[PDB]
Amino acid sequence: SKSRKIAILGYRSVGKSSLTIQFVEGQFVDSYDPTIENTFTKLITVNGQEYHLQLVDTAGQDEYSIFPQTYSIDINGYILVYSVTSIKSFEVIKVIHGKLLDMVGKVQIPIMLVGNKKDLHMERVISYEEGKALAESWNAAFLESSAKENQTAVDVFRRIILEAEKMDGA
Amino acid sequence: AGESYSRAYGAMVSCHMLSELEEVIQYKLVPERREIIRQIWWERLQGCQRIVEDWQKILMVRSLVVSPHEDMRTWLKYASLCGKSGRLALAHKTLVLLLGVDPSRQLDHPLPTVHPQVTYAY
Amino acid sequence: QAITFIFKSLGLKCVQFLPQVMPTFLNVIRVCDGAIREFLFQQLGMLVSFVKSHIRPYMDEIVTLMREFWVMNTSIQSTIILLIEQIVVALGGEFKLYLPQLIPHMLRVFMHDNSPGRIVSIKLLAAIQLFGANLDDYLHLLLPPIVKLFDAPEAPLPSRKAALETVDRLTESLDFTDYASRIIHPIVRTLDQSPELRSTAMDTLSSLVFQLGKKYQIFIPMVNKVLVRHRINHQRYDVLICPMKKLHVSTINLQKAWGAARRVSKDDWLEWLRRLSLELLKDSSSPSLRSCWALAQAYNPMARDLFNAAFVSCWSELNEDQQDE
Amino acid sequence: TSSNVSVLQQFASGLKSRNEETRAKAAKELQHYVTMELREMSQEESTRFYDQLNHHIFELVSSSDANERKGGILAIASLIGVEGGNATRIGRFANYLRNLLPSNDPVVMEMASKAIGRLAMAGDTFTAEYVEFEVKRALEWLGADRNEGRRHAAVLVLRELAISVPTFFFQQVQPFFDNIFVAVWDPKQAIREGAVAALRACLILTTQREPKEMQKPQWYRHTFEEAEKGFDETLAKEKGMNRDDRIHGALLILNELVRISSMEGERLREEMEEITQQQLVHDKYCKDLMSTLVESRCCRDLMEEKFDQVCQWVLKCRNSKNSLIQMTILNLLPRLAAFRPSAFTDTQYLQDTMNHVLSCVKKEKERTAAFQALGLLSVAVRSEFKVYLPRVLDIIRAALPPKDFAHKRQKAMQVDATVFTCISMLARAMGPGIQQDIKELLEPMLAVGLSPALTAVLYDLSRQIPQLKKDIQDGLLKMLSLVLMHKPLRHASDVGSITLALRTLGSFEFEGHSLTQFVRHCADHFLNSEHKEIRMEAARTCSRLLTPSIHLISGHAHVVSQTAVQVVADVLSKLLVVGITDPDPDIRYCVLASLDERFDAHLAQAENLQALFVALNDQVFEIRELAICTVGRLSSMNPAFVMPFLRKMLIQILTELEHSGIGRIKEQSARMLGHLVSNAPRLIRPYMEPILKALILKLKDPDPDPNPGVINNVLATIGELAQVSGLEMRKWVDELFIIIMDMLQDSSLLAKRQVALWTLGQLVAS
Ligand SMILES: Nc1nc2c(ncn2[C@@H]2O[C@H](COP(=O)(O)OP(=O)(O)OP(O)(O)=S)[C@@H](O)[C@H]2O)c(=O)[nH]1
């Protein structure tokens, strides 16, 4: 068994909390409670190896909000989440990635980008292509997920675990 | 001291004792400050609460270098404090110690006069 | 960052904490480091938006600080502009009284941007939609800058498009039947100058004509000639014929924080107390306390201060068995 | 801020030089620069400056070059725990260090592990969580299949985290005891020894935490069962790994358990180990030319009830051909003997262990450990060693050069310190009994040549058996005469040899007057030698050697001799000439610090007062501090030539403090004034009023200078001025209270709480 923390970052009002509950409970409820700081846990299996995941949903951040140092000490894995239905979320996730790297220099660290609210195809204002382009601009791994498509959330968290494993192997 | 100064007075008496102990170091080292250190001791004692249990410790710490006769009046106050604290026997002991003679064994004999202040206190 | 997260959570109840927060808060904006004043202004805007109209007694000090820190720096300019946006949303009519104290600042911003940071004007212009009826007595001050922005060749195209959109949004909230109708003439030159931008120009013209009503219909022929030369049509032309709730106390980590099993030395016990006081805040059910956890972590005396309240918040959620443990 | 950037530019370029010495010099240069030159600026701009600093760090750590990475790691290590535990430091430092551990080179390996230890030791708010990560990571790296490099990483990180900060590590004690024994059986020796070292540190932690435990622990017992499993033949049938490796692991585990259970037998080991490391340090210096003691009650009980088992296991593994197991046994057997010697005597374990260890001295690679065991066993058993006394003594004699030194002259051979330390503990065991034996052994040890181990054991033999003490001096003194003057003691050469000769000459006590012959010589050649180390050492020794001569002037006034007085006087003049005229500042500082009050009688003379006055205006500040301290002390001796000079000086510091606007000069002037005040009360007492006025207006200045040194040193000077003038300040004390309280209540003012409170207390007392 390997204990892994993950930190979920991004703009406010994007479904970081929704993704966390979807992955850890399989449900999705629209209350919109601004999450100051939340922690969830599971004991899952990836590639036949048991990972005890501890997910830390951070409060939404803006381009002016300072990056707390708590999520730079013992995180070993990051999920940068943005809403595909908000260009502001995309710009702010760019800013948040910049501030995170600044908090760790520019050291290589497992980071993966998530296009959230994919089901809202009508309201989409970020397509797949530019999200990818940003991801391999960061050398990160791209995915798209929604709080109504639990398979995608499981894919997201499995992917960040795999990225952490790959970075560890190097 | 996180609750009230009243509780912290027990430890503040210890602080007083330790600082006076450093002043005993200075008193032994520097003969020129002996009168000044004596006056500082007197004033600080006057500032303390008039409890025999603490005056005893403070004067006992002071006794390292200064005998009662060298600070007569100070001990007289202690005697007075013991006189009105349900410890009259200790007050008599202090006063006979300061006089050097015990009139309690010489009732017919008139009292000493070489030190009139202590005679008055006794 | 903590105070905001409290004011956001409580809602209008947060007004009860105004007289404590603001007099210090504004003062800190006056004496804080330059690197932090931008963040403090942004959080001031957020707090003002949450408070809505109950920010009147502090609005004079707020605008004073705004005036004496609205230097021509792009970052602070943008943050302050956001703060005016949020103040306009919060107050509206009352903010009229405080409008005249900011007009010279707006004008200097308009005529003193010399970089791609010219985008700041757009953000300032992005505030002008939200003004509406409170711009009546000062519309004629703010008009000639936008008049210049219509036909400015030096200004970037998106800035001019933004200016057209701004006057468009102003159209349905202000009485343009007065002298302001003269803005018809500027956009005409824009139609005959910039081809890529004609669409927003004609949308703006349609909205202005709709606001004006009969008073414009007399002067149609010049605009009709422009349209015929450009051959771009619109429907309106033909119409000219006529709280935050509680939070789940994570029980596992809560009794885990009370892990006095292998704590022996004095240093061990002090560390246990520190970790427990922090974990109580982290697992506190009330968002107000949990907002203080980040600050408590980097400042232990805060954790010591709220240990009792944090324990009360954590304890009231547990059931009989968890309480017994 | 062009300077603030360019300085880091040249620091980075220097740290990128492939020379180890250049990188290290740049490392301490950067350490100095950030330590005592970038504290004039506050904490928030310190965090801002750390961004540029860490950018420059990672510019070194970014490259894959081993040397560039090593230089970056040196920068990180020097920068960890040097300033306050600021915010931006720890996250970047942790993330930088986490990449280094999987590396292969043990150098960067240990460097990164120690860096993690110091970072956790930094004592910031994020250390706790940080520790819980690293330990977990380390433990996670022990559960891997083999994962060699990461296993060594976990081992070293756990070791350095355990010693560095125990409080946070103890919460991971149970997983550590569950996982470390996986790495103890690793088939590589380095991982094994490191893992046993991490177990050592954790066991020490458990030992501090033991006596106050409510109930006895189980970690010691579990460790013993793990060792037993290691020695079990049936459980040793695991494939793919060597039996001897399991034997070594079990032996190391048992060694550590015994050590934490046998501190009394470990103290002598530690002292002898310090002597051996002194020998190694001397050897390293010559090459470069060209702790806490605790006993676990529960572990002691466990080994008391399982002593025969461990002894039988060790004596069964005695016959192993592998060298590592042989050395571990040689280290363990004396520890067992020191644990419960009575069982050694009664159970007759002496024969096998003694025959084995006397067989080991013949072996080449075990010879050092062989003498280790001989020396420790001699003191372990003080009665049954008599039967073996000749059998070891002849081995020491054979190891040392033979009696015929001139005929059979050694070509090139160094006697390892373990032989000398074995002699020392052998004397400790049966000192008076073997007095003649050590007397005979004395000559070849002197014939070996000067070594730190030799001098240490000669000192020990002198203290243990004073009867022949005078011999040890009379020989060694002659040896010194053969290396300093290159002549027999009558009544070029290696820099390190002369350095150690000076060390022992100044340190080892002698009664014969012949030391005076050295003194003048040390003041004639060595002080004038072009080697800075020889000059420094000559100055030191010449300072130490004159105290008996000055005692006649001070204590035994009836025996004052003009010969000794003149020798002291002209040697002192030569020392002052050395300490003034030498451009090197370190020699000046050492020389001036080496003049105590003893020499004041000869320093009161105008000739030496002139040299001291010259030092009193030295370019370097610390030398100035010693100079002013000395002159203030001498003011009581020769007021004529000092009091006017110190009055002019006092005027100079007052002028500099009142006029100079730069913070550093203000701080230096405040320190100078404080030293003058503490050292010359008679001078300052009449001039207390203007000095106090100047200091007060320096405290109440409307413009607070960025640095805190000025206000701190002004407060310290005010405090010791109060100490000088008792009641003269009584009528300027209330304003001082107002000022001191005002700066105490609010921490925005640069004044520090420590010195403010000290000044308040000194004012009250005075
Ligand atoms: N339709 C749709 N709504 C979604 C989706 N993901 C999230 N939401 C909705 O968006 C809202 C906000 O998401 P949430 O998870 O609460 O944001 P957050 O970032 O955690 O909350 P904050 O503390 O950071 S402000 C929720 O009410 C949720 O129902 C999605 O994929 N589709």
Ligand SMILES: [Mg+2]
């Ligand atoms: Mg949220």
